Ligand binder design. Structure first.
Ligand SMILES: Nc1ncnc2c1ncn2[C@@H]1O[C@H](COP(=O)(O)OP(=O)(O)OP(=O)(O)O)[C@@H](O)[C@H]1O
Ligand SMILES: Nc1ncnc2c1ncn2[C@@H]1O[C@H](COP(=O)(O)OP(=O)(O)OP(=O)(O)O)[C@@H](O)[C@H]1O
Ligand SMILES: Nc1ncnc2c1ncn2[C@@H]1O[C@H](COP(=O)(O)OP(=O)(O)OP(=O)(O)O)[C@@H](O)[C@H]1O
Ligand SMILES: Nc1ncnc2c1ncn2[C@@H]1O[C@H](COP(=O)(O)OP(=O)(O)OP(=O)(O)O)[C@@H](O)[C@H]1O
Ligand SMILES: Nc1ncnc2c1ncn2[C@@H]1O[C@H](COP(=O)(O)OP(=O)(O)O)[C@@H](O)[C@H]1O
Ligand SMILES: [Mg+2]
Ligand SMILES: [Mg+2]
Ligand SMILES: [Mg+2]
Ligand SMILES: [Mg+2]
Lengths: 592, 298, 394
């Protein structure tokens, strides 16, 4: 067996030495493998399944059963050798060397008789030696597989099986495929229970049952591109490694949650006293940047504290909001403030300017090109952005300016929390917050009233009139199902004088931050602030015109002075007002 | 009606009487939104295979362009992506016995229907490889939400009589059938085994849905060693608040998340409801001013 | 190790010779890399990030840490070798030559257990072997990686990780991805302060404290296609090279601003008295081409003066104007005169004739065709022009 083990590995000996992990719950698959191995003709099966599901574990368990002797009498004591492809090729420099090596191995198999071959990467068998020798390492294997005097086991993934083996119809019928399925949650729990004892020794820790259950559930729920039996295992392994590096040395659910949160970024870790930072304080944190919009801030805070405090729908995104209202009231500012609150920087928001989606075909920018068309090599932009960062805030700005046959693609995102890439990959939106900003039903607010005689009316009446009109416009614009799959529709009231008087402070602070780069500052005495708020109220255009005032009444004059050399670095500007009837002076004085 | 039709199809297939030239069943679900067209497919998939994830679901809103049929066929020879076949064909080939679902099939390009005529009558489909994939052992469901603007309106122009639950369903069924006939080709509708129109949800039906949704909330709470219990008055109030004769059961879910889930969230955050406790929800007040009351026990 | 030294480079010895630049502020990344490396089955971390955020610097910092005595157990006295993958395929003329090298080096690794492999551009590992009758290096390395007898650290960018390493899921599942995020502004300041001592010696100059802050801020604000930790270093290093070519030596923020202005074209350098006087007489300069129309010239001058005085909003264009008027009064002439005053002539104006945009489906002339449509690679016509000249008049 020197030619055998010098080109292979003895799995039976390894199983006898207990160097192999236990295999649990694969009785049906192993039984089917043994059933196929006993056929008179074409007695060589191949295991097909997704990567990580444990295709090699089936052969490992078969070897362990052979060692332990629970196999039918037709097998009994037969050595299971894993063939090491590449070792055959590692020295076949001259013509006719790989061929003679393989022939010697096969003749050894025939003479000894009781050997079962295992070829791990069966798709690599095709064209293993397709060189000037021109044998392919499979053209000669065909007669033995056809007649049935050679017994082998293969294990390839579905994609490799379709791409490589299915081309050769000759090798297609020589093998018997066996599906290996992804284990369910209880099966994964049992597998973890079995491997727990083996994993204890390596890290010198202790693992609880609750830790195993939490690892299985969290791996099933929060990891998308990997398959179930492996994610739980490597979460447990990483938690054990962390606990070992930290040094009773026990791991539990909180450690697993911390490891998972660190891996993906989704906040699934335990609630410390930072729960006070969101309870009764998230609204204040948002109001430190957004002034006078209590309903939308309240809704956002409710959604965030709901998804953070445990209970939340595990099949739908965290929240879906439609922000409607007049222009320049703070619809986008609120989204930026929420992004800053959640991530520490407003650049973490995933923003989509829907004004560039005015055509039907531009929807391919969300998905990607279909197979066989240019640009198919790279996927959709939005899908890639979401896939890289599962927990984020997605904003659709100016939602009403895109083609109506675009939001049909949002139906599965809002209700089912997923989107299918053009390459077939599924990207989950279950951890994102969707915000759509619009401006519908607002163009007539400049004049008020509809037509004909109307009631007395007041501030509440105008708001109630606007809300119903916006709702009607939304209903006539969007399909009823799209509005059905929406968590909240929030209408923004127009700003008032007090709101503007509060906003001028924020804008002056921004101007001060701009000046701080070149070592200056500004004062804006109270009368100047009140006059500045007085000029530029305009309750039709929101807070934008006020900004223009600050642009054309302050930072022009300062600029002139800065250019003239009147005021230099190391000074600040104090602004005051003079006069009563028009009181429009804005005297600036530069002092250290 | 839909449950009976689906069960009849399954029983007929299982008794060795179904046509060996056509798929096991071909259904078109139509009606309002939030009635349970998609829920029935998940329930059937869970019944047949023991897990609702065993459903082959296609979102047809991504097939709004004619050149996206290769996404389910495969690219033509010599083009990028030939090494990978059609996404749907491979899935059906690996599992010959499965349930195929087409969500919002009316939003896709008409050329998509060009393919389905092969499945609905011939029972096989051919991909770009030249291989032939059979659909004889599958159950094909197309969910459609056509003509839904009329249901939102309700009634018709004129002096319509005071009708009962029977008349409204008949009018909705007639309108939906007329819309389906107008929108789709006669050949496609002729080949479909069943066209099932889902009637609206009644007030009595809402109570059991409340029970199911509260059970789901309790399942969520059990993950942190917690539970929730509701009195009959609480469920009655929830059914009264969450009833909407047009939008289905989704407004009920919104009401449940607004009145129950939120207050539970603030109470959990405040430390009022520690782990290892049970939340009891009852009612207080009379008339339309009734309000839920939350209490914690061991 | 002589066998390893033929194909590869010892990172630990290079770190011991102080030939690696110091690494600052990457405690979390190094900690998680060590955490993954001390696992049982798949202890093979791969670092994914943007091209320039400092993925290799994390590994060099790990090397400096392992030869410092400051790493946890099971990692002390380990030896990091950067594998080539270029010499392995080089000299593989005959069949069974490339594989022979891998088997030999892998047996060497097995014999000498305290060795950790490091592979730059892990994406080229797949298919690296050959066509025809030869299995790639990925197939050879799969059995050892999954079982856990060969520790390996990889590094790829997101695009190449997704485009090449993801067509082979079997190889992908054997690596645990770790994301390296772009550093923030204060982190970039700390990195610049750390590297100031090393960068001063090569240029034999002095970098003032304010120069680092100016370089970081200007690079973060005025450069778009690059990433933060690299662009500021580029600014500092090029300023130093510039002034040593010019020639005690001291580099201040003004050199950084002038270098950035020369590189990009945006005027960010300091105001001279001549420039201040010219900006103040901008109205008289513009009136040599336009007669009358005082208000429009005044508005343009005010906008330019706000831009140059440093009071411009850093999130919005310098100015946006709607010139409404009768025919032949000087609406286009004023734009041409402004363009001539600004850069060098009226030929630098980016002019778009809206008469051509009569159909609402012509918007693709600003954007380009969506993926899967004719003309997709050409890109937008306005976007490309603006990208080529960030400071222009549209
Ligand atoms: N039934 C099982 N019992 C115990 N452990 C299992 C079982 N199935 C899989 N595993 C474990 O899952 C991990 C990966 O499984 P394995 O290596 O067998 O996958 P594979 O299907 O051969 O995948 P690959 O495509 O990477 O070759 C190993 O740690 C293995 O021990
Ligand atoms: N409530 C507010 N608090 C603070 N700043 C505000 C508020 N409302 C508006 N602003 C300011 O107005 C400017 C633009 O507002 P924003 O971008 O939020 O408008 P919008 O509501 O999204 O309008 P549009 O419909 O034009 O998109 C910003 O400078 C922003 O700071
Ligand atoms: N008959 C029902 N029994 C239980 N739950 C129901 C029922 N009808 C609807 N629901 C609930 O309504 C929500 C969504 O319903 P579902 O997705 O089945 O509706 P649909 O008919 O597919 O709607 P759409 O037209 O929007 O696709 C789920 O929470 C589901 O549990
Ligand atoms: N104020 C001005 N000073 C000098 N030349 C002027 C002035 N106004 C117009 N012109 C002359 O008018 C001619 C071109 O006018 P211009 O293109 O500026 O017109 P316009 O106002 O943009 O009108 P339109 O676009 O409606 O045709 C040139 O010969 C230019 O010298
Ligand atoms: N934490 C850090 N401390 C100091 N310098 C760093 C740090 N991270 C990156 N750098 C510097 O930034 C540059 C990044 O180059 P490189 O590592 O090649 O980028 P990439 O990781 O994309 O390959 C290096 O020259 C390095 O000196
Ligand atoms: Mg395997
Ligand atoms: Mg906005
Ligand atoms: Mg549905
Ligand atoms: Mg003109």
């Amino acid at each position: 067996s020197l030619v055998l083990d010098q080109f292979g590995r003895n799995l039976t000996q390894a199983a006898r030495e207990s160097k192999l992990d236990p295999v649990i719950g694969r009785e049906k698959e192993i039984e089917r493998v043994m059933q196929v191995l006993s056929r008179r003709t074409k007695n060589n099966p191949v295991l097909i399944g997704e990567p990580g599901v444990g295709k090699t574990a089936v052969v490992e368990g078969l070897a362990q059963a052979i060692v332990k002797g629970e196999v039918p009498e037709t097998l009994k004591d037969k050595h299971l050798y894993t063939l090491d492809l590449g070792a055959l090729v590692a020295g076949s420099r001259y013509r006719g060397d790989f061929e003679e090596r393989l022939k010697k191995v096969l003749k050894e198999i025939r003479t000894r008789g009781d050997i079962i071959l295992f070829i791990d990467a069966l798709h690599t068998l095709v064209g293993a030696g397709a060189a000037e020798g021109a044998i392919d390492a499979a053209s000669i294997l065909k007669p033995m597989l056809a007649r049935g005097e050679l017994q082998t086991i293969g294990a390839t993934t579905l994609d490799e099986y379709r791409k490589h083996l299915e081309k050769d119809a000759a090798l297609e019928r020589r093998f018997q495929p066996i599906q290996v399925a992804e284990p369910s949650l209880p099966h994964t729990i049992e597998i973890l229970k079995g491997l727990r004892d083996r994993y204890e020794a390596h890290h010198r820790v202790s693992i609880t049952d609750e830790a195993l259950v939490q690892a299985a559930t969290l791996a099933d729920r929060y990891i998308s591109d990997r398959f179930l039996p492996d994610k739980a295992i490597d979460l447990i392994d990483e938690a054990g490694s962390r606990m070992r590096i930290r040094r009773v040395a026990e791991v539990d659910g909180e450690l697993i949650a911390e490891v998972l949160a660190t891996a993906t970024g989704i906040p699934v870790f335990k609630l410390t006293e930072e729960e006070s930072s969101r309870l009764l304080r998230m609204e204040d944190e948002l109001h430190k940047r957004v002034i006078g919009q209590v309903d939308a801030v309240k809704a956002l805070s409710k959604a965030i504290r709901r998804t953070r405090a445990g209970l939340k729908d595990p099949k739908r995104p965290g929240g879906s909001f439609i922000f409607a209202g007049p222009s320049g009231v703070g619809k986008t500012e609120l989204s930026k403030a929420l992004a800053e609150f959640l991530f520490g920087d407003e650049d973490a928001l995933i923003s989509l300017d829907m004004s560039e989606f005015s055509e039907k075909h531009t929807v391919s920018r969300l998905f990607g090109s279909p197979p066989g068309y240019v640009g198919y090599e790279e996927g959709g932009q939005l899908t890639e952005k979401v896939r890289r960062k599962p927990f984020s805030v997605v904003l659709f700005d100016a939602v009403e300016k895109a083609h109506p046959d675009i939001f049909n693609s949002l139906l599965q995102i809002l209700e089912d929390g997923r989107l299918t890439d053009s390459q077939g990959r599924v990207v989950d939106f279950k951890n994102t917050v969707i915000i759509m900003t619009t401006n519908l039903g607002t163009r007539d607010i400049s004049k008020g009233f509809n037509l004909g005689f109307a009631a007395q009316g007041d501030t509440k009446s105008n708001y109630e009139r606007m809300k119903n009109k916006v709702s009607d416009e939304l209903k006539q614009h969007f399909r009823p199902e799209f509005l059905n799959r929406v968590d909240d529709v929030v209408v923004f009231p127009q700003l008032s004088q007090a709101d503007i008087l509060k906003i001028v402070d924020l804008m002056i602070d921004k101007v001060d931050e701009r000046l701080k780069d070149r070592d200056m500052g500004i004062e804006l005495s109270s009368s100047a602030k009140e006059l500045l708020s007085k000029k530029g109220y305009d309750p039709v255009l929101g807070a934008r015109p006020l900004r223009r005032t600050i642009q054309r009444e302050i930072e022009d004059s300062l600029s002139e002075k800065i250019l003239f050399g009147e005021l230099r670095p190391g000074h600040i500007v104090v602004v005051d007002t003079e006069g009563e009837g028009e009181t429009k002076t804005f005297t600036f004085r530069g002092e250290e």
